[PDB]
Design a protein around this ligand. Sequence first.
Ligand SMILES: [Cl-]
Length: 298
Amino acid sequence: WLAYDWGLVFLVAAIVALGFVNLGSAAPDPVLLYRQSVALGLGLLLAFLLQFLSRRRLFGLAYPLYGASLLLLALVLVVGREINGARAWFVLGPLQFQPLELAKLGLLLALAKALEGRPIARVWDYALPALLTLPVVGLLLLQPDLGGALVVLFGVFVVVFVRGLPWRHLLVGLFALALLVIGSGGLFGKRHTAFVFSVWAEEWGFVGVVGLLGLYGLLLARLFALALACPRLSDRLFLSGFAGMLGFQVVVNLGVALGVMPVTGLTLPLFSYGGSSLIATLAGLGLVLLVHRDRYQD
Ligand SMILES: [Cl-]
């Protein structure tokens, strides 16, 4: 039927097109743009394939996907490939799959589903999110990769806070974990990650950064608007956790790019270089779009 919110689609497409028109000038290379074109193709294809999935099945898979992401996080520690001092990637030749993304989505689904029963015992308000998040954050710290750990923990914080459970301990853990880590016009196109962002910030200047931060602000706004437009509470929680994680990566790259936090492996979603991050962001956006399209169904 295609009863989606096409505004969010246009926002995602606009950020993606900005990322692509920037990469073609921010340290370009004939062979480095092909990888990202194929990543975009795979991402759109996967986000389309996932549209043949009802939300009932998707939340039926809330617990199996969480278990598979836990076991996959455990397995990457044994048979992974070290990159920047941590084994956090599965490399099978041309295939590059990082279990962090599966962990994020599985935990969001699992917590959303397990946290939609309004009455709870007076003890599990602390323990259930604890015992569902701690294995993930711990297996993320054994790599070690604390950027994804921060994203995961902050997502869990957003889910808990929107729900209405104890969240202050989660912020304590979050802040504690984060401590052990050219004009108005610009140039217009005239190897670390932040280079992808430093070239946009310098070749396009204040209008460029204002426009990009505005695109991200509108995306987070539309996500949180779709979140409170769902009758079921599990959907509200899932959408808000996703939007939280996205905004958190964005503000992390903000402080990384402007000399605040030490850099992490967290890219700017839909914008920074990275085929797996692009594909995973597209897949998560496909999930959020399909859970929004099925909001008035049983
Ligand atoms: Cl609290």
